[PDB]
Write a protein that binds this ligand. Sequence first.
Ligand SMILES: CNC(=O)c1cnc(N)c(O[C@H]2CN(C(=O)Cc3ccc(OC(F)(F)F)cc3)CC2(F)F)c1
Ligand SMILES: O=c1[nH]cnc2scc(-c3ccccc3)c12
Length: 279
Amino acid sequence: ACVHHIKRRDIVLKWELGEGAFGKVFLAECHNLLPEQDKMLVAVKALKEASESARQDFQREAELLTMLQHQHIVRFFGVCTEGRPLLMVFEYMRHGDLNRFLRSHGPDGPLGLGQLLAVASQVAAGMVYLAGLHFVHRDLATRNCLVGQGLVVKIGDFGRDIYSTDYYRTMLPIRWMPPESILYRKFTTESDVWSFGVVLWEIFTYGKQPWYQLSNTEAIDCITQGRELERPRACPPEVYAIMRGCWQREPQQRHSIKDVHARLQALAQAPPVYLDVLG
Ligand SMILES: CNC(=O)c1cnc(N)c(O[C@H]2CN(C(=O)Cc3ccc(OC(F)(F)F)cc3)CC2(F)F)c1
Ligand SMILES: O=c1[nH]cnc2scc(-c3ccccc3)c12
Protein backbone atom coordinates (compact mmCIF):
# COMPACT_ATOMS: atom_id res chain seq x y z
CA ALA A 1 0.00 0.00 0.00
CA CYS A 2 2.32 2.83 1.26
CA VAL A 3 5.68 2.39 -0.52
CA HIS A 4 8.86 3.26 1.38
CA HIS A 5 11.25 5.71 -0.43
CA ILE A 6 14.99 5.18 0.01
CA LYS A 7 17.47 8.01 -0.67
CA ARG A 8 19.86 7.35 -3.62
CA ARG A 9 22.90 8.25 -1.44
CA ASP A 10 21.87 5.57 1.10
CA ILE A 11 22.53 2.88 -1.63
CA VAL A 12 26.15 1.98 -2.46
CA LEU A 13 26.40 -0.35 -5.53
CA LYS A 14 28.97 -3.11 -4.99
CA TRP A 15 28.66 -5.64 -7.86
CA GLU A 16 26.34 -6.70 -10.73
CA LEU A 17 24.46 -9.95 -9.88
CA GLY A 18 22.74 -10.19 -13.28
CA GLU A 19 20.92 -8.46 -16.13
CA GLY A 20 17.98 -8.82 -18.51
CA ALA A 21 16.18 -6.74 -21.15
CA PHE A 22 14.56 -4.79 -18.17
CA GLY A 23 17.93 -3.60 -16.80
CA LYS A 24 20.27 -4.85 -14.06
CA VAL A 25 20.37 -6.51 -10.62
CA PHE A 26 23.07 -5.27 -8.22
CA LEU A 27 24.52 -6.34 -4.89
CA ALA A 28 24.47 -3.17 -2.74
CA GLU A 29 24.98 -1.85 0.80
CA CYS A 30 21.96 0.08 2.13
CA HIS A 31 22.36 2.65 4.97
CA ASN A 32 19.60 3.67 7.48
CA LEU A 33 17.24 0.80 6.58
CA LEU A 34 17.04 -1.70 9.49
CA PRO A 35 17.66 -0.89 13.22
CA GLU A 36 21.07 -1.79 14.79
CA GLN A 37 22.38 -2.29 11.14
CA ASP A 38 24.15 0.97 9.99
CA LYS A 39 25.13 -0.94 6.78
CA MET A 40 23.41 -4.08 5.31
CA LEU A 41 23.53 -6.11 2.07
CA VAL A 42 20.58 -5.74 -0.36
CA ALA A 43 19.76 -6.80 -3.92
CA VAL A 44 18.83 -3.79 -6.12
CA LYS A 45 16.69 -4.24 -9.27
CA ALA A 46 17.32 -1.25 -11.65
CA LEU A 47 14.85 -0.52 -14.48
CA LYS A 48 16.36 0.74 -17.81
CA GLU A 49 13.03 2.39 -19.00
CA ALA A 50 11.95 5.66 -17.31
CA SER A 51 8.77 6.35 -19.45
CA GLU A 52 5.45 7.42 -17.76
CA SER A 53 3.96 3.95 -18.62
CA ALA A 54 7.01 2.11 -17.08
CA ARG A 55 6.82 4.44 -14.00
CA GLN A 56 3.09 3.55 -13.50
CA ASP A 57 3.68 -0.25 -13.76
CA PHE A 58 6.70 0.14 -11.40
CA GLN A 59 4.43 1.97 -8.82
CA ARG A 60 1.76 -0.79 -9.18
CA GLU A 61 4.43 -3.52 -8.67
CA ALA A 62 6.03 -1.65 -5.68
CA GLU A 63 2.58 -1.34 -3.97
CA LEU A 64 1.87 -5.07 -4.49
CA LEU A 65 5.37 -5.97 -3.20
CA THR A 66 4.77 -3.73 -0.11
CA MET A 67 1.54 -5.75 0.70
CA LEU A 68 3.15 -9.25 0.52
CA GLN A 69 4.53 -9.96 4.03
CA HIS A 70 5.61 -13.52 4.83
CA GLN A 71 8.50 -15.63 6.20
CA HIS A 72 8.85 -17.40 2.82
CA ILE A 73 8.33 -14.45 0.44
CA VAL A 74 11.57 -12.44 -0.50
CA ARG A 75 11.40 -9.16 1.54
CA PHE A 76 10.87 -5.83 -0.31
CA PHE A 77 12.35 -2.71 1.42
CA GLY A 78 11.23 0.09 -0.89
CA VAL A 79 12.04 2.20 -3.95
CA CYS A 80 14.33 4.90 -5.23
CA THR A 81 12.68 7.08 -7.87
CA GLU A 82 15.41 9.84 -7.83
CA GLY A 83 15.66 9.94 -11.64
CA ARG A 84 16.70 7.14 -14.00
CA PRO A 85 17.07 4.14 -13.34
CA LEU A 86 14.07 3.45 -11.06
CA LEU A 87 15.36 1.19 -8.19
CA MET A 88 13.62 -1.58 -6.19
CA VAL A 89 15.41 -2.67 -2.97
CA PHE A 90 15.10 -6.25 -1.69
CA GLU A 91 16.86 -8.30 1.01
CA TYR A 92 19.98 -10.00 -0.42
CA MET A 93 19.56 -13.85 -0.57
CA ARG A 94 23.18 -14.92 -0.12
CA HIS A 95 22.85 -18.38 -1.79
CA GLY A 96 21.16 -17.14 -4.98
CA ASP A 97 18.38 -18.86 -6.88
CA LEU A 98 17.19 -22.34 -5.75
CA ASN A 99 17.80 -23.93 -9.19
CA ARG A 100 21.55 -23.06 -9.11
CA PHE A 101 21.74 -23.97 -5.35
CA LEU A 102 20.17 -27.46 -5.98
CA ARG A 103 22.62 -28.14 -8.87
CA SER A 104 25.66 -26.96 -6.80
CA HIS A 105 24.59 -29.21 -3.86
CA GLY A 106 23.68 -32.16 -6.09
CA PRO A 107 25.36 -35.58 -6.63
CA ASP A 108 27.23 -34.09 -9.68
CA GLY A 109 28.27 -32.34 -0.29
CA PRO A 110 24.81 -33.48 -1.50
CA LEU A 111 21.63 -32.30 0.27
CA GLY A 112 20.04 -35.08 2.33
CA LEU A 113 16.39 -36.22 2.27
CA GLY A 114 15.56 -34.11 5.35
CA GLN A 115 17.03 -30.95 3.73
CA LEU A 116 15.13 -31.62 0.44
CA LEU A 117 11.82 -31.97 2.43
CA ALA A 118 12.52 -28.71 4.37
CA VAL A 119 13.17 -26.85 1.02
CA ALA A 120 9.86 -28.22 -0.42
CA SER A 121 7.88 -27.41 2.78
CA GLN A 122 9.18 -23.75 2.82
CA VAL A 123 8.21 -23.22 -0.91
CA ALA A 124 4.75 -24.73 -0.08
CA ALA A 125 4.38 -22.35 2.94
CA GLY A 126 4.98 -19.24 0.77
CA MET A 127 2.42 -20.57 -1.79
CA VAL A 128 -0.19 -21.11 1.02
CA TYR A 129 0.24 -17.38 1.84
CA LEU A 130 -0.12 -16.35 -1.87
CA ALA A 131 -3.21 -18.63 -2.36
CA GLY A 132 -4.78 -17.08 0.78
CA LEU A 133 -4.53 -13.61 -0.89
CA HIS A 134 -5.88 -15.05 -4.21
CA PHE A 135 -2.47 -14.18 -5.73
CA VAL A 136 -1.46 -16.28 -8.77
CA HIS A 137 2.38 -16.36 -9.34
CA ARG A 138 2.24 -17.66 -12.98
CA ASP A 139 6.03 -18.46 -13.00
CA LEU A 140 6.58 -20.79 -10.10
CA ALA A 141 9.88 -22.64 -10.62
CA THR A 142 13.09 -23.17 -8.60
CA ARG A 143 14.81 -20.44 -10.74
CA ASN A 144 12.28 -18.00 -9.08
CA CYS A 145 12.93 -19.28 -5.51
CA LEU A 146 15.87 -17.97 -3.48
CA VAL A 147 18.05 -19.32 -0.66
CA GLY A 148 19.23 -17.10 2.15
CA GLN A 149 21.12 -17.57 5.42
CA GLY A 150 20.59 -20.96 7.15
CA LEU A 151 18.90 -22.75 4.19
CA VAL A 152 15.91 -20.33 4.44
CA VAL A 153 14.01 -20.64 1.14
CA LYS A 154 11.72 -17.89 -0.13
CA ILE A 155 9.60 -17.30 -3.25
CA GLY A 156 10.54 -14.37 -5.53
CA ASP A 157 10.49 -13.54 -9.26
CA PHE A 158 13.46 -12.32 -11.31
CA GLY A 159 11.01 -11.11 -14.02
CA ARG A 160 16.45 -12.24 -16.28
CA ASP A 161 18.83 -13.65 -18.97
CA ILE A 162 20.50 -17.00 -17.90
CA TYR A 163 17.12 -18.86 -18.01
CA SER A 164 15.71 -18.06 -21.52
CA THR A 165 16.00 -21.87 -22.21
CA ASP A 166 13.05 -22.21 -19.70
CA TYR A 167 10.69 -20.07 -21.84
CA TYR A 168 9.07 -20.61 -25.25
CA ARG A 169 7.47 -17.92 -27.53
CA THR A 170 4.87 -13.82 -25.24
CA MET A 171 7.44 -16.05 -23.41
CA LEU A 172 5.78 -19.00 -21.60
CA PRO A 173 7.48 -21.33 -19.01
CA ILE A 174 5.73 -24.29 -20.80
CA ARG A 175 7.48 -27.15 -18.86
CA TRP A 176 5.98 -25.86 -15.53
CA MET A 177 2.48 -25.25 -17.02
CA PRO A 178 -0.66 -27.47 -16.79
CA PRO A 179 -2.69 -28.32 -19.99
CA GLU A 180 -5.34 -25.56 -19.39
CA SER A 181 -2.56 -22.84 -19.23
CA ILE A 182 -0.73 -24.10 -22.41
CA LEU A 183 -3.99 -24.46 -24.45
CA TYR A 184 -6.10 -21.58 -23.05
CA ARG A 185 -3.62 -19.17 -21.26
CA LYS A 186 -5.81 -19.70 -18.10
CA PHE A 187 -3.67 -19.03 -14.95
CA THR A 188 -5.15 -19.79 -11.47
CA THR A 189 -4.36 -21.07 -7.91
CA GLU A 190 -4.84 -24.57 -9.56
CA SER A 191 -2.18 -23.92 -12.24
CA ASP A 192 0.19 -22.76 -9.39
CA VAL A 193 -0.47 -26.14 -7.64
CA TRP A 194 0.58 -28.00 -10.91
CA SER A 195 3.74 -25.79 -11.11
CA PHE A 196 4.45 -26.73 -7.43
CA GLY A 197 4.29 -30.42 -8.42
CA VAL A 198 6.99 -29.63 -11.05
CA VAL A 199 8.98 -27.61 -8.38
CA LEU A 200 8.87 -30.77 -6.17
CA TRP A 201 10.26 -32.79 -9.12
CA GLU A 202 13.05 -30.17 -9.63
CA ILE A 203 13.93 -30.36 -5.90
CA PHE A 204 14.17 -34.20 -5.88
CA THR A 205 16.25 -34.27 -9.17
CA TYR A 206 18.65 -31.64 -7.69
CA GLY A 207 17.53 -29.01 -10.26
CA LYS A 208 17.19 -30.94 -13.52
CA GLN A 209 15.08 -29.49 -16.35
CA PRO A 210 11.53 -31.13 -16.59
CA TRP A 211 11.38 -33.23 -19.80
CA TYR A 212 15.15 -32.39 -20.41
CA GLN A 213 15.37 -35.08 -23.13
CA LEU A 214 12.73 -33.16 -25.20
CA SER A 215 12.39 -29.91 -27.17
CA ASN A 216 9.68 -27.36 -26.12
CA THR A 217 7.20 -28.69 -28.79
CA GLU A 218 7.64 -32.34 -27.66
CA ALA A 219 7.20 -31.33 -23.96
CA ILE A 220 3.84 -29.56 -24.87
CA ASP A 221 2.69 -32.89 -26.44
CA CYS A 222 3.71 -34.83 -23.26
CA ILE A 223 1.89 -32.31 -20.99
CA THR A 224 -1.29 -31.98 -23.16
CA GLN A 225 -1.42 -35.83 -23.77
CA GLY A 226 -1.35 -36.65 -20.03
CA ARG A 227 2.24 -37.99 -19.84
CA GLU A 228 3.82 -37.75 -16.33
CA LEU A 229 7.39 -37.05 -15.17
CA GLU A 230 8.83 -40.21 -13.64
CA ARG A 231 9.70 -40.61 -9.93
CA PRO A 232 13.20 -39.17 -9.18
CA ARG A 233 15.74 -41.59 -7.58
CA ALA A 234 16.06 -39.31 -4.46
CA CYS A 235 12.24 -39.09 -4.24
CA PRO A 236 10.45 -41.43 -1.73
CA PRO A 237 7.11 -42.95 -2.94
CA GLU A 238 5.26 -40.77 -0.32
CA VAL A 239 6.59 -37.50 -1.97
CA TYR A 240 5.88 -38.78 -5.52
CA ALA A 241 2.23 -39.42 -4.43
CA ILE A 242 2.11 -35.65 -3.41
CA MET A 243 3.53 -34.64 -6.88
CA ARG A 244 0.90 -36.81 -8.66
CA GLY A 245 -1.83 -35.10 -6.60
CA CYS A 246 -0.58 -31.75 -8.03
CA TRP A 247 -0.69 -33.10 -11.62
CA GLN A 248 -4.37 -34.10 -12.02
CA ARG A 249 -5.42 -33.24 -15.61
CA GLU A 250 -8.60 -31.46 -14.40
CA PRO A 251 -7.80 -28.33 -12.27
CA GLN A 252 -10.72 -29.14 -9.88
CA GLN A 253 -9.25 -32.56 -9.06
CA ARG A 254 -5.79 -31.30 -7.92
CA HIS A 255 -5.10 -31.03 -4.13
CA SER A 256 -5.25 -27.58 -2.46
CA ILE A 257 -1.81 -26.06 -1.64
CA LYS A 258 -2.74 -25.96 2.15
CA ASP A 259 -3.19 -29.77 2.09
CA VAL A 260 0.05 -30.26 0.00
CA HIS A 261 1.89 -28.02 2.57
CA ALA A 262 0.46 -29.96 5.58
CA ARG A 263 1.61 -33.32 4.06
CA LEU A 264 5.15 -31.97 3.26
CA GLN A 265 5.56 -30.32 6.69
CA ALA A 266 4.62 -33.66 8.40
CA LEU A 267 7.28 -35.47 6.28
CA ALA A 268 9.89 -32.68 6.91
CA GLN A 269 9.45 -33.13 10.73
CA ALA A 270 9.54 -36.99 10.45
CA PRO A 271 11.34 -38.07 7.19
CA PRO A 272 10.42 -41.51 5.75
CA VAL A 273 13.26 -44.04 5.95
CA TYR A 274 14.24 -43.91 2.27
CA LEU A 275 17.68 -44.47 0.72
CA ASP A 276 18.03 -43.16 -2.89
CA VAL A 277 20.78 -45.82 -3.60
CA LEU A 278 18.21 -48.60 -2.80
CA GLY A 279 15.52 -46.95 -4.98
C1 LIG B 1 23.12 -14.11 -6.88
N1 LIG B 1 22.01 -13.61 -6.08
C2 LIG B 1 20.96 -13.03 -6.65
O1 LIG B 1 20.84 -12.98 -7.87
C3 LIG B 1 19.93 -12.40 -5.75
C4 LIG B 1 19.95 -12.40 -4.36
N2 LIG B 1 18.97 -11.86 -3.62
C5 LIG B 1 17.93 -11.27 -4.24
N3 LIG B 1 16.99 -10.69 -3.48
C6 LIG B 1 17.85 -11.19 -5.64
O2 LIG B 1 16.85 -10.41 -6.18
C7 LIG B 1 16.31 -10.71 -7.45
C8 LIG B 1 15.08 -11.60 -7.26
N4 LIG B 1 14.03 -10.64 -6.96
C9 LIG B 1 12.85 -11.02 -6.44
O3 LIG B 1 12.62 -12.19 -6.20
C10 LIG B 1 11.84 -9.92 -6.18
C11 LIG B 1 10.47 -10.39 -5.74
C12 LIG B 1 9.47 -10.62 -6.68
C13 LIG B 1 8.23 -11.10 -6.29
C14 LIG B 1 7.97 -11.35 -4.95
O4 LIG B 1 6.73 -11.83 -4.51
C15 LIG B 1 6.29 -13.01 -4.96
F1 LIG B 1 5.21 -13.35 -4.31
F2 LIG B 1 5.95 -12.99 -6.21
F3 LIG B 1 7.10 -14.02 -4.83
C16 LIG B 1 8.94 -11.09 -4.00
C17 LIG B 1 10.18 -10.61 -4.40
C18 LIG B 1 14.39 -9.27 -7.34
C19 LIG B 1 15.74 -9.36 -8.03
F4 LIG B 1 15.63 -9.38 -9.40
F5 LIG B 1 16.54 -8.30 -7.72
C20 LIG B 1 18.86 -11.78 -6.39
O1 LIG C 1 29.78 -6.61 -11.49
C1 LIG C 1 30.92 -6.62 -11.96
N1 LIG C 1 31.39 -7.74 -12.66
C2 LIG C 1 32.62 -7.83 -13.23
N2 LIG C 1 33.55 -6.90 -13.17
C3 LIG C 1 33.13 -5.76 -12.44
S1 LIG C 1 34.18 -4.41 -12.21
C4 LIG C 1 32.93 -3.59 -11.36
C5 LIG C 1 31.77 -4.28 -11.25
C6 LIG C 1 30.60 -3.63 -10.60
C7 LIG C 1 30.75 -2.95 -9.40
C8 LIG C 1 29.69 -2.23 -8.86
C9 LIG C 1 28.48 -2.18 -9.51
C10 LIG C 1 28.31 -2.87 -10.69
C11 LIG C 1 29.36 -3.60 -11.23
C12 LIG C 1 31.90 -5.56 -11.86
